[PDB]
């Protein structure tokens, strides 16, 4: 049945699902409902071109997003800027979620930061998977949907920063994970141990050890139907590393062809040295 | 199938033992000391190398005259030769894996083209320790520092593999564990260009169940080892991508036609 052992683990699972919902306004469940239908009130405004993009800015909040680097002739940059701000947003949330992870705050302050430094993007693109389908991605809190095609056609460099994300989202979404799973999986990602510079690695590993244990049970209980989902899920941590690095490559490029474009501080401190 | 995962294991093990000459247990026998007389010829610098030329006569990879005149070039040169040696040992082990032969010819090739690198490094860990690597069927042992001691790009083509070994070996896996682990890497359903992924995954899924059981029985003590091992698969891709990058700069050197073709 259930033993004292598994029980501790299910409680950890529930504690995290609870923090998860409390930290991310736009969950996978909400996003799915928005993407699939079953709705009359949650349908998004679709953007697939400059005009729709134009009427787009109109129906939805596209200026508290585009930092003051406003009216910047090339739309591509405007878009990129929207994306960047939304990432800073995500970092913040993830940071909020992190603190709730049992044991995380009790660590060396420099390490707390190190885990965030590298775990953050791997997480953003994991969660970003939740707002995408092969056709495109949700934006502005779900109120909108930008076509994968619109993005892919943007100015030479820019029109290339989202494809990898889409490539992964398709694979990853095929795992059919739900919000309660992702909450634990994201936890595991934070408590790595192989992050560069980690002063006291051991305590971090004992934490992750319990999380992996929590995820194993969770996946087994939530997805009997799917065998070795646990394994298949972990293997996916490879795709994340590469997506991350490709992006970084891209930031390098932009930091030159566009020396007039600004960068958000928080995103700066993260990137440096990845 | 509680018993099936055990049979797939012994079989893979049995097969692994037959395909690979230098095993973990053995390589371990050497390195350390435990039951050893044969003791390896250490290569820590230039002259210890030279003496190696004719001693271990490891030169299976050097008789290559008029092109055998510049240390850092012949070592890496050699390294590659032993790689190609490993590839054949791997390709052969592949055929032992239940179902491998039954897959589409082109996919068998593809799994191999994109999997041998990751496996070369996993087994290479068996021949390393923080201070060096076992060469020529374990007759020698080339020191770690002498390698960083290599001039130009040649000073960091083994260092990465060394860092990996250190972390990997920390798992204390044996040949029994590795055998199944190797099979998993091969049966990767996400290699580019495949044609029929289902059969592959079906097999990897079966191999994964075997590994999981193997690790629990062989290491009751070590909690979540299965998880930690699968994570290392990530360490590998980084390493294989990176390695492949050094090959780029390496294009800018030494400035036979069949030799290249060979490689
Ligand atoms: C990049 C991602 C960022 C995820 C943290 N995203 O799809 O949200 C991206 C691509 C396009 C946009 C975007 C364009 C215009 C307006 C917005 C908005 O949130 O208002 C986002 O962001
Ligand atoms: C590189 C590794 C790669 C194995 C597939 N290795 O052979 O352990 C490497 C480093 C040094 C050498 C080497 C130099 C000279 C002679 C030999 C030999 O095996 O006889 C190896 O290879």
Coordinates of C-alpha atoms and ligand atoms in Angstrom, one line a residue:
Chain A
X1 CA 0.0 0.0 0.0
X2 CA 1.6 3.2 1.3
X3 CA 4.3 3.3 4.0
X4 CA 5.7 6.0 6.3
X5 CA 8.4 6.3 3.6
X6 CA 6.3 7.1 0.5
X7 CA 4.0 9.3 2.6
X8 CA 6.8 11.8 3.4
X9 CA 7.4 12.0 -0.3
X10 CA 3.8 12.6 -1.3
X11 CA 3.7 15.5 1.2
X12 CA 6.8 17.0 -0.4
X13 CA 5.1 16.6 -3.7
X14 CA 2.0 18.4 -2.5
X15 CA 4.0 21.2 -0.8
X16 CA 5.7 21.9 -4.0
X17 CA 2.6 21.8 -6.2
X18 CA 1.2 24.3 -3.7
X19 CA 4.2 26.6 -4.0
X20 CA 4.2 26.2 -7.7
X21 CA 0.6 27.5 -8.2
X22 CA 1.4 30.2 -5.6
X23 CA 4.4 31.4 -7.7
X24 CA 3.3 31.2 -11.4
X25 CA 0.1 33.0 -12.5
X26 CA 0.0 31.3 -15.8
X27 CA 0.0 27.5 -15.2
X28 CA 0.1 24.8 -17.8
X29 CA -3.5 23.9 -17.0
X30 CA -4.6 27.5 -17.7
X31 CA -2.5 27.7 -20.8
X32 CA -3.9 24.5 -22.2
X33 CA -7.4 25.5 -21.6
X34 CA -6.6 28.7 -23.4
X35 CA -4.9 27.0 -26.4
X36 CA -7.3 24.2 -27.0
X37 CA -10.7 25.9 -26.7
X38 CA -13.5 24.9 -24.3
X39 CA -13.6 28.7 -24.1
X40 CA -15.6 31.7 -25.1
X41 CA -13.9 34.1 -22.7
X42 CA -10.2 32.9 -22.7
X43 CA -9.4 33.1 -26.4
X44 CA -6.3 35.1 -27.3
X45 CA -5.6 37.7 -30.0
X46 CA -3.5 36.0 -32.7
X47 CA -0.4 37.7 -34.2
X48 CA 1.0 36.4 -37.4
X49 CA 2.1 39.6 -39.1
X50 CA 2.9 43.3 -38.8
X51 CA -0.7 44.4 -39.2
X52 CA -2.1 41.9 -36.8
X53 CA 1.0 42.7 -34.7
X54 CA -0.1 46.3 -35.1
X55 CA -3.7 45.8 -34.1
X56 CA -2.2 43.5 -31.6
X57 CA -0.3 46.2 -29.7
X58 CA -3.8 47.8 -29.8
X59 CA -6.1 45.2 -28.0
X60 CA -3.3 44.1 -25.6
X61 CA -0.8 45.7 -23.3
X62 CA 2.3 46.0 -25.4
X63 CA 4.0 49.0 -23.8
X64 CA 4.5 48.0 -20.1
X65 CA 6.3 45.1 -21.8
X66 CA 8.4 46.9 -24.4
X67 CA 10.8 48.9 -22.1
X68 CA 11.0 52.6 -23.0
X69 CA 13.2 51.5 -25.9
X70 CA 9.8 52.1 -27.7
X71 CA 9.1 53.1 -31.3
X72 CA 12.3 51.4 -32.5
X73 CA 11.8 51.2 -36.3
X74 CA 12.6 47.5 -36.6
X75 CA 9.8 45.5 -35.0
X76 CA 12.1 42.5 -34.5
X77 CA 14.0 44.4 -31.8
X78 CA 10.7 45.5 -30.1
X79 CA 9.7 41.8 -30.0
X80 CA 13.0 40.7 -28.6
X81 CA 12.6 43.4 -26.0
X82 CA 9.2 42.1 -25.1
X83 CA 10.6 38.6 -24.7
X84 CA 13.5 39.8 -22.5
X85 CA 11.2 41.6 -20.1
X86 CA 9.0 38.6 -19.8
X87 CA 12.1 36.5 -19.0
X88 CA 13.1 38.8 -16.2
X89 CA 9.6 38.3 -15.1
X90 CA 10.0 34.5 -15.1
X91 CA 13.3 34.7 -13.3
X92 CA 11.6 36.6 -10.5
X93 CA 8.9 34.0 -10.2
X94 CA 11.3 31.1 -10.3
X95 CA 13.3 32.9 -7.7
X96 CA 10.1 33.1 -5.6
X97 CA 9.5 29.4 -6.1
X98 CA 13.1 28.5 -5.2
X99 CA 12.9 29.9 -1.7
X100 CA 10.0 27.6 -1.0
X101 CA 12.1 24.6 -1.8
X102 CA 12.8 22.9 1.5
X103 CA 16.5 23.3 2.4
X104 CA 17.3 25.8 -0.3
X105 CA 17.4 29.0 1.8
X106 CA 19.3 27.1 4.5
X107 CA 22.3 27.0 2.2
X108 CA 25.4 29.1 1.7
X109 CA 24.2 32.4 0.2
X110 CA 26.8 32.2 -2.6
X111 CA 25.5 28.8 -3.6
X112 CA 21.9 29.8 -3.5
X113 CA 22.8 32.4 -6.1
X114 CA 24.9 29.9 -8.1
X115 CA 22.0 27.5 -8.5
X116 CA 19.8 30.3 -9.7
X117 CA 22.4 31.6 -12.0
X118 CA 22.5 28.4 -14.0
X119 CA 19.1 26.7 -13.2
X120 CA 17.1 29.8 -14.3
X121 CA 17.1 29.5 -18.0
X122 CA 16.8 25.7 -18.1
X123 CA 13.6 26.4 -16.1
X124 CA 12.3 29.2 -18.2
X125 CA 12.4 27.1 -21.3
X126 CA 10.9 24.1 -19.5
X127 CA 7.9 26.2 -18.4
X128 CA 7.8 28.1 -21.7
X129 CA 7.0 24.7 -23.2
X130 CA 3.7 24.9 -21.3
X131 CA 2.6 27.9 -23.4
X132 CA 3.5 26.4 -26.8
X133 CA 2.2 24.0 -29.4
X134 CA 3.8 23.3 -32.7
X135 CA 2.0 26.4 -34.1
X136 CA 3.1 29.1 -31.7
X137 CA 3.3 30.5 -28.2
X138 CA 1.2 32.4 -25.7
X139 CA 2.3 35.9 -24.7
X140 CA 1.1 38.8 -22.5
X141 CA -0.2 36.3 -19.9
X142 CA -2.2 34.3 -22.3
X143 CA -4.1 37.2 -23.7
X144 CA -2.2 36.7 -27.0
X145 CA -0.6 34.1 -29.2
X146 CA 2.3 34.7 -31.5
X147 CA 2.7 32.3 -34.5
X148 CA 5.9 30.3 -34.7
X149 CA 6.0 31.4 -38.3
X150 CA 5.9 35.1 -37.6
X151 CA 8.9 34.7 -35.3
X152 CA 10.8 32.5 -37.6
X153 CA 10.6 35.2 -40.3
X154 CA 12.0 38.1 -38.3
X155 CA 15.3 39.8 -39.2
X156 CA 18.1 37.4 -39.9
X157 CA 19.5 36.9 -36.4
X158 CA 16.3 37.6 -34.4
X159 CA 14.2 35.4 -36.6
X160 CA 16.2 32.5 -35.1
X161 CA 16.1 32.8 -31.4
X162 CA 12.8 31.0 -30.8
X163 CA 13.0 27.9 -33.1
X164 CA 15.1 25.8 -30.8
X165 CA 12.6 26.5 -28.0
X166 CA 9.8 25.3 -30.3
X167 CA 11.9 22.3 -31.3
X168 CA 12.1 21.2 -27.7
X169 CA 8.6 22.2 -26.7
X170 CA 7.3 19.7 -29.2
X171 CA 9.4 16.9 -27.8
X172 CA 9.0 17.8 -24.2
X173 CA 5.2 18.4 -24.5
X174 CA 5.0 14.9 -25.9
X175 CA 5.7 13.7 -22.4
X176 CA 2.3 15.1 -21.5
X177 CA 3.4 16.3 -18.1
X178 CA 1.0 18.3 -15.9
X179 CA 1.6 21.1 -13.4
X180 CA 2.1 18.9 -10.4
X181 CA 4.9 17.0 -12.1
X182 CA 6.7 20.1 -13.5
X183 CA 6.8 21.7 -10.0
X184 CA 9.0 18.8 -8.7
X185 CA 11.0 18.5 -11.9
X186 CA 11.8 22.2 -11.8
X187 CA 12.9 21.8 -8.1
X188 CA 15.3 19.0 -9.2
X189 CA 16.8 21.3 -11.8
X190 CA 17.5 24.0 -9.2
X191 CA 19.2 21.6 -6.8
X192 CA 21.8 20.4 -9.3
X193 CA 25.3 20.2 -7.8
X194 CA 27.2 20.3 -11.0
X195 CA 26.9 24.0 -11.2
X196 CA 30.3 25.7 -11.6
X197 CA 31.8 27.1 -8.4
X198 CA 29.4 25.4 -6.0
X199 CA 31.2 25.8 -2.6
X200 CA 29.4 23.0 -0.6
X201 CA 28.1 20.6 -3.2
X202 CA 27.1 17.8 -0.7
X203 CA 24.1 19.4 1.1
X204 CA 22.8 20.3 -2.4
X205 CA 22.9 16.7 -3.5
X206 CA 21.1 15.4 -0.4
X207 CA 18.3 17.8 -1.3
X208 CA 18.1 16.8 -4.9
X209 CA 18.3 13.2 -3.8
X210 CA 15.0 13.6 -2.0
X211 CA 13.5 15.5 -4.9
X212 CA 14.4 12.8 -7.4
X213 CA 12.8 10.4 -5.0
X214 CA 9.8 12.7 -4.9
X215 CA 9.6 12.9 -8.7
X216 CA 9.9 9.1 -9.1
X217 CA 6.9 8.5 -6.9
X218 CA 4.9 11.4 -8.4
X219 CA 5.4 10.2 -12.0
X220 CA 4.7 6.6 -11.0
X221 CA 1.5 7.6 -9.2
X222 CA 0.4 10.2 -11.7
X223 CA 1.4 8.2 -14.9
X224 CA 1.2 4.5 -14.4
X225 CA 0.3 4.2 -18.1
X226 CA 3.8 5.6 -18.9
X227 CA 6.8 3.4 -18.2
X228 CA 10.3 4.9 -17.6
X229 CA 8.8 8.4 -17.9
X230 CA 11.1 9.1 -15.0
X231 CA 14.1 8.2 -17.1
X232 CA 12.8 9.8 -20.3
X233 CA 12.1 13.0 -18.3
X234 CA 15.7 13.2 -17.0
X235 CA 17.3 12.5 -20.4
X236 CA 15.5 15.7 -21.5
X237 CA 17.9 17.7 -19.3
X238 CA 20.3 17.5 -22.2
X239 CA 18.1 19.4 -24.6
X240 CA 17.9 22.2 -22.1
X241 CA 21.6 22.7 -21.8
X242 CA 22.0 23.1 -25.5
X243 CA 19.0 25.4 -25.9
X244 CA 20.5 27.5 -23.2
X245 CA 23.9 27.7 -24.9
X246 CA 22.6 28.3 -28.3
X247 CA 20.7 31.3 -26.9
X248 CA 23.9 32.6 -25.3
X249 CA 25.7 32.3 -28.6
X250 CA 22.9 34.5 -29.9
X251 CA 23.2 37.2 -27.2
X252 CA 26.9 37.4 -28.1
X253 CA 26.0 38.2 -31.7
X254 CA 23.4 40.8 -30.8
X255 CA 25.8 42.5 -28.3
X256 CA 27.7 43.6 -31.4
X257 CA 25.4 44.0 -34.5
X258 CA 23.2 46.0 -32.2
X259 CA 25.4 48.0 -29.8
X260 CA 22.5 50.5 -29.3
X261 CA 20.2 47.8 -27.8
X262 CA 20.2 47.7 -24.1
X263 CA 20.1 44.6 -21.8
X264 CA 18.3 44.0 -18.5
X265 CA 20.7 44.0 -15.5
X266 CA 19.3 40.8 -14.0
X267 CA 19.7 39.0 -17.4
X268 CA 23.2 40.4 -17.5
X269 CA 24.4 39.0 -14.2
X270 CA 22.9 35.6 -15.1
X271 CA 24.5 35.3 -18.6
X272 CA 28.0 36.4 -17.7
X273 CA 30.2 33.3 -17.7
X274 CA 27.5 30.8 -19.0
Chain B
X1 CA 9.6 -10.0 -16.3
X2 CA 11.1 -9.6 -12.9
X3 CA 13.5 -12.3 -14.0
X4 CA 13.8 -11.1 -17.6
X5 CA 15.6 -7.9 -16.5
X6 CA 18.1 -10.2 -14.8
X7 CA 18.7 -12.3 -17.9
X8 CA 19.1 -9.3 -20.2
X9 CA 21.7 -8.2 -17.7
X10 CA 23.8 -11.3 -17.4
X11 CA 23.6 -11.7 -21.2
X12 CA 24.7 -8.1 -21.8
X13 CA 27.4 -8.5 -19.2
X14 CA 28.6 -11.9 -20.7
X15 CA 28.6 -10.2 -24.1
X16 CA 30.3 -7.1 -22.7
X17 CA 33.1 -9.3 -21.3
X18 CA 33.6 -10.9 -24.7
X19 CA 33.6 -7.7 -26.7
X20 CA 35.9 -5.6 -24.5
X21 CA 39.5 -6.7 -23.7
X22 CA 40.3 -4.2 -21.1
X23 CA 37.5 -4.2 -18.5
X24 CA 36.9 -1.9 -15.5
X25 CA 37.8 -4.6 -13.0
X26 CA 41.0 -5.3 -14.8
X27 CA 41.9 -1.7 -15.5
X28 CA 41.3 -1.2 -11.8
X29 CA 43.5 -4.2 -10.9
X30 CA 46.3 -2.3 -12.6
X31 CA 46.1 1.4 -11.8
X32 CA 46.0 0.9 -8.0
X33 CA 48.1 -2.2 -7.2
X34 CA 45.9 -5.0 -5.8
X35 CA 47.2 -8.3 -7.2
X36 CA 49.7 -6.9 -9.7
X37 CA 53.3 -7.7 -10.9
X38 CA 53.0 -6.6 -14.5
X39 CA 53.1 -3.0 -13.4
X40 CA 52.7 -0.3 -16.2
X41 CA 55.3 1.9 -17.9
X42 CA 54.7 5.4 -16.7
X43 CA 54.9 8.3 -19.3
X44 CA 55.3 11.6 -17.4
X45 CA 57.5 13.5 -19.8
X46 CA 59.4 13.6 -23.2
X47 CA 62.0 10.9 -22.6
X48 CA 59.6 8.4 -20.8
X49 CA 57.6 8.8 -24.0
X50 CA 60.4 8.1 -26.4
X51 CA 61.4 5.0 -24.4
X52 CA 57.7 4.1 -24.9
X53 CA 58.1 4.2 -28.7
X54 CA 60.2 1.0 -28.7
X55 CA 59.5 -0.4 -25.2
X56 CA 55.7 -0.9 -25.2
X57 CA 56.4 -0.8 -29.0
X58 CA 52.9 0.7 -28.7
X59 CA 54.0 2.1 -32.0
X60 CA 51.3 0.0 -33.7
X61 CA 50.3 3.6 -34.4
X62 CA 53.6 5.3 -35.4
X63 CA 55.8 3.2 -37.8
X64 CA 54.2 5.9 -40.0
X65 CA 57.5 7.3 -41.1
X66 CA 58.3 10.9 -42.2
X67 CA 55.2 12.2 -40.3
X68 CA 56.4 10.9 -36.9
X69 CA 58.5 14.0 -36.0
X70 CA 56.7 16.1 -33.3
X71 CA 55.4 14.7 -30.0
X72 CA 52.1 16.5 -29.4
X73 CA 51.1 15.4 -32.9
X74 CA 51.7 11.7 -32.5
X75 CA 50.1 11.4 -29.2
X76 CA 46.8 12.8 -30.4
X77 CA 47.5 10.9 -33.6
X78 CA 47.7 7.8 -31.6
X79 CA 44.7 8.5 -29.4
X80 CA 42.6 8.5 -32.5
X81 CA 44.0 5.2 -33.6
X82 CA 42.9 3.5 -30.4
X83 CA 39.5 5.2 -30.9
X84 CA 39.0 3.4 -34.2
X85 CA 40.0 0.3 -32.3
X86 CA 37.3 0.9 -29.8
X87 CA 34.6 1.6 -32.4
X88 CA 34.9 -1.9 -33.8
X89 CA 34.7 -3.3 -30.3
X90 CA 31.6 -1.2 -29.7
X91 CA 29.9 -2.0 -33.0
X92 CA 30.4 -5.6 -32.1
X93 CA 28.9 -5.2 -28.7
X94 CA 25.9 -3.5 -30.3
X95 CA 25.0 -6.6 -32.2
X96 CA 24.7 -8.4 -28.9
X97 CA 21.9 -6.1 -27.7
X98 CA 18.5 -7.9 -28.1
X99 CA 16.7 -6.3 -31.0
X100 CA 19.6 -4.2 -32.3
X101 CA 20.1 -6.4 -35.3
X102 CA 16.4 -6.5 -36.0
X103 CA 16.2 -2.8 -36.6
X104 CA 16.4 -1.1 -40.0
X105 CA 20.0 -1.2 -41.4
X106 CA 20.2 2.6 -41.8
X107 CA 19.1 3.1 -38.2
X108 CA 21.7 0.6 -36.9
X109 CA 24.3 2.7 -38.7
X110 CA 22.9 6.0 -37.4
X111 CA 22.7 4.8 -33.8
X112 CA 26.3 3.9 -34.1
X113 CA 27.6 7.0 -35.8
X114 CA 26.1 9.2 -33.1
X115 CA 26.6 6.9 -30.1
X116 CA 30.3 5.7 -30.3
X117 CA 31.7 9.0 -29.0
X118 CA 29.6 9.0 -25.9
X119 CA 30.5 5.4 -25.2
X120 CA 34.2 5.9 -26.0
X121 CA 34.3 8.4 -23.1
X122 CA 32.2 6.4 -20.7
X123 CA 34.6 3.5 -21.0
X124 CA 37.6 5.8 -21.1
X125 CA 36.7 6.7 -17.6
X126 CA 37.3 3.1 -16.6
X127 CA 41.0 3.6 -17.7
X128 CA 41.5 6.9 -15.9
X129 CA 42.0 8.3 -12.4
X130 CA 42.6 11.9 -11.3
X131 CA 46.3 11.6 -12.2
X132 CA 46.3 9.8 -15.6
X133 CA 45.2 7.3 -18.2
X134 CA 45.9 3.7 -19.1
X135 CA 47.2 3.3 -22.6
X136 CA 48.1 0.4 -25.0
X137 CA 45.9 -2.3 -23.7
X138 CA 46.9 -1.1 -20.2
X139 CA 50.6 -1.7 -20.8
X140 CA 51.2 2.0 -20.2
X141 CA 49.9 4.9 -18.2
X142 CA 50.2 8.4 -19.6
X143 CA 50.2 10.9 -16.7
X144 CA 47.6 13.7 -16.5
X145 CA 50.0 16.7 -16.1
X146 CA 52.1 15.6 -19.1
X147 CA 49.0 16.0 -21.2
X148 CA 48.1 19.5 -20.0
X149 CA 51.8 19.8 -20.6
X150 CA 51.0 19.6 -24.3
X151 CA 51.6 22.6 -26.4
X152 CA 48.8 24.4 -28.4
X153 CA 45.3 23.0 -28.6
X154 CA 46.8 19.6 -27.8
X155 CA 46.9 20.6 -24.1
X156 CA 43.2 20.4 -23.5
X157 CA 41.8 17.5 -25.6
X158 CA 42.1 15.1 -22.6
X159 CA 41.6 17.5 -19.7
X160 CA 37.8 17.6 -20.2
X161 CA 37.6 13.9 -20.5
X162 CA 39.6 13.8 -17.2
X163 CA 37.1 16.1 -15.4
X164 CA 34.3 13.8 -16.5
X165 CA 36.0 10.7 -15.5
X166 CA 36.5 12.0 -12.0
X167 CA 32.8 12.7 -11.5
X168 CA 31.7 9.6 -13.4
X169 CA 33.9 7.2 -11.4
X170 CA 32.5 8.7 -8.3
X171 CA 29.5 6.5 -9.0
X172 CA 31.5 3.3 -8.3
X173 CA 29.8 1.5 -11.2
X174 CA 31.2 -1.9 -12.3
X175 CA 31.3 -3.7 -15.7
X176 CA 28.0 -5.2 -14.9
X177 CA 26.4 -1.8 -14.5
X178 CA 28.3 -0.2 -17.5
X179 CA 27.3 -3.0 -19.9
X180 CA 23.6 -2.1 -19.5
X181 CA 24.4 1.6 -19.4
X182 CA 26.3 1.3 -22.7
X183 CA 23.3 -0.3 -24.3
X184 CA 21.1 2.5 -23.2
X185 CA 23.3 5.2 -24.8
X186 CA 23.2 3.2 -28.1
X187 CA 19.4 2.8 -28.2
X188 CA 18.8 6.6 -28.1
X189 CA 15.6 7.4 -30.0
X190 CA 16.6 11.0 -30.5
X191 CA 19.5 10.6 -32.9
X192 CA 19.2 12.8 -36.0
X193 CA 18.0 11.0 -39.2
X194 CA 16.3 8.0 -37.7
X195 CA 13.6 6.2 -39.6
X196 CA 11.8 4.0 -37.0
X197 CA 12.0 5.3 -33.5
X198 CA 9.4 3.1 -31.8
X199 CA 11.4 -0.1 -31.9
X200 CA 14.5 1.7 -30.6
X201 CA 12.7 3.3 -27.7
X202 CA 10.9 0.0 -27.0
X203 CA 14.4 -1.5 -26.5
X204 CA 15.9 1.4 -24.6
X205 CA 12.8 1.2 -22.3
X206 CA 13.6 -2.5 -21.7
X207 CA 17.2 -1.7 -21.1
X208 CA 16.3 1.1 -18.7
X209 CA 14.2 -1.3 -16.6
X210 CA 17.2 -3.7 -16.5
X211 CA 19.6 -1.0 -15.5
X212 CA 17.3 0.2 -12.8
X213 CA 17.1 -3.3 -11.3
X214 CA 20.8 -3.9 -11.8
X215 CA 21.6 -0.7 -9.8
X216 CA 19.2 -1.5 -7.0
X217 CA 20.5 -5.0 -6.5
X218 CA 24.2 -4.1 -7.0
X219 CA 23.9 -1.0 -4.9
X220 CA 21.1 -1.1 -2.3
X221 CA 23.1 1.4 -0.4
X222 CA 23.4 4.2 -3.0
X223 CA 20.0 6.0 -3.2
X224 CA 18.8 7.3 -6.6
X225 CA 22.0 6.2 -8.4
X226 CA 19.9 5.5 -11.5
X227 CA 18.9 9.1 -11.6
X228 CA 22.4 10.3 -11.1
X229 CA 23.7 8.0 -13.9
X230 CA 21.1 9.2 -16.4
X231 CA 22.1 12.8 -15.6
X232 CA 25.7 12.1 -16.5
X233 CA 24.4 11.4 -20.1
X234 CA 24.2 15.2 -20.1
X235 CA 27.8 15.6 -19.1
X236 CA 28.6 13.5 -22.2
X237 CA 26.8 15.5 -24.9
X238 CA 28.6 18.6 -23.7
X239 CA 31.8 16.7 -23.8
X240 CA 31.1 15.2 -27.3
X241 CA 30.1 18.5 -28.7
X242 CA 33.1 20.3 -27.2
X243 CA 35.5 17.5 -28.3
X244 CA 34.1 18.0 -31.8
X245 CA 34.9 21.7 -31.5
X246 CA 38.6 21.1 -30.7
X247 CA 38.7 19.1 -34.0
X248 CA 38.0 22.5 -35.7
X249 CA 41.1 24.3 -34.5
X250 CA 43.0 21.0 -35.0
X251 CA 42.2 21.7 -38.7
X252 CA 44.8 24.5 -38.4
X253 CA 47.9 22.3 -37.8
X254 CA 50.9 20.3 -39.2
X255 CA 51.6 23.0 -41.7
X256 CA 48.8 9.1 -45.5
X257 CA 46.1 10.3 -47.8
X258 CA 44.6 6.9 -47.0
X259 CA 45.5 7.4 -43.4
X260 CA 43.1 10.4 -43.3
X261 CA 40.5 8.4 -45.1
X262 CA 40.9 5.8 -42.4
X263 CA 40.0 8.5 -39.9
Ligands
LIG1 C1 9.9 35.3 -25.7 C2 9.3 34.4 -24.6 C3 9.8 34.8 -23.2 C4 9.4 33.7 -22.1 C5 9.8 34.1 -20.7 N1 7.8 34.5 -24.7 O1 7.2 33.9 -25.8 O2 7.0 35.1 -23.7 C6 8.9 36.2 -26.4 C7 8.6 36.0 -27.7 C8 7.7 37.0 -28.0 C9 7.4 37.7 -26.9 C10 6.5 38.8 -26.7 C11 6.2 39.7 -27.8 C12 5.3 40.8 -27.6 C13 4.7 41.0 -26.4 C14 4.9 40.0 -25.3 C15 4.2 40.3 -23.9 O3 4.4 39.4 -23.0 O4 3.4 41.2 -23.8 C16 5.8 38.9 -25.5 O5 8.2 37.2 -25.9
LIG2 C1 43.3 9.4 -26.0 C2 42.4 8.2 -25.5 C3 41.3 7.9 -26.5 C4 40.8 6.4 -26.4 C5 39.7 6.1 -27.4 N1 43.2 7.0 -25.2 O1 43.9 6.3 -26.2 O2 43.3 6.6 -23.8 C6 44.9 9.1 -25.9 C7 45.7 9.8 -25.1 C8 46.9 9.3 -25.2 C9 46.9 8.3 -26.1 C10 47.9 7.5 -26.6 C11 49.2 8.0 -27.0 C12 50.2 7.1 -27.5 C13 50.0 5.7 -27.5 C14 48.7 5.2 -27.1 C15 48.3 3.7 -27.1 O3 47.2 3.4 -26.7 O4 49.1 2.8 -27.5 C16 47.7 6.1 -26.6 O5 45.6 8.2 -26.6

